[PDB]
Design a protein around this ligand. Sequence first.
Ligand code: D2Y
Length: 165
Amino acid sequence: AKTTQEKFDALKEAGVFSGYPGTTDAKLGQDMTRAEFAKVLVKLFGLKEIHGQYSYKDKNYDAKNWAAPFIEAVTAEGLMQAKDLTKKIFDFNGKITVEEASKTLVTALKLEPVKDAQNKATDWAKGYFEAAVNAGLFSKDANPKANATRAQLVEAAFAADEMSK
Ligand SMILES: CO[C@@H]1O[C@H](CO)[C@@H](O[C@@H]2O[C@@H]3CO[C@](C)(C(=O)O)O[C@H]3[C@H](O)[C@@H]2NC(C)=O)[C@H](O)[C@H]1NC(C)=O
C-alpha cells in the first residue's frame, strides 16, 4: 500500500516518470499536459520514440521541444490524435480531461467499455469512464469532465503498469 508520492517514486525508478529538471517537486496537484500524457503513454505501452520528424505546425513544436519524440510516437500509434486534423495542431501545453484519459487508457489496455454506463461523463466517454473506474484507473467520484491532475495520472499509470506486467 503506497501514497501517490510513493507511486510516483516507484514509477520514476521504473523510468515511466522522471519529474521536472532542477526540482524534486513532482507537482502532483497541477493539471497534466497533453505532452506529459504522450510521454507516460510511450513508457507504459513500450512505444518507439520518433526523433527528427514533426507532424504538427504548433509554434515551438520542433527539435527544441522535448515532447516531440513522444507526441510523434502516440500520433503514429493512434493513442492520441490532433486537436485540429486540418491545421495539424497538437496543442502540447493543452490539458486532458479524466474522461479523455479514461478512453485512451481503457483502449490501450484492451479493456471493453461498459454498455449503458450510469455516470456524469460526456455521452462518448460514459462506457470508458465506467470501465476505467472498474479497473481502478480513476476514482468513481472523479469529475470525468475535469482536467486530470498529475496525481490522477500517477495513480492511473501505477495501476496500468501493474495490470500490464
Ligand atoms: C523548458 O520546459 C521544460 O522542459 C523540460 C525538459 O527539458 C520538461 O521536462 C519534462 O517534464 C515532464 C513532466 O512530466 C513527465 C510525465 C514526468 O515524468 O513527470 O514527463 C517529464 C519529461 O520526461 C521531462 N522531464 C525531464 C526531467 O526531462 C519540462 O516539463 C518543461 N517545463 C515546462 C514548464 O513546460
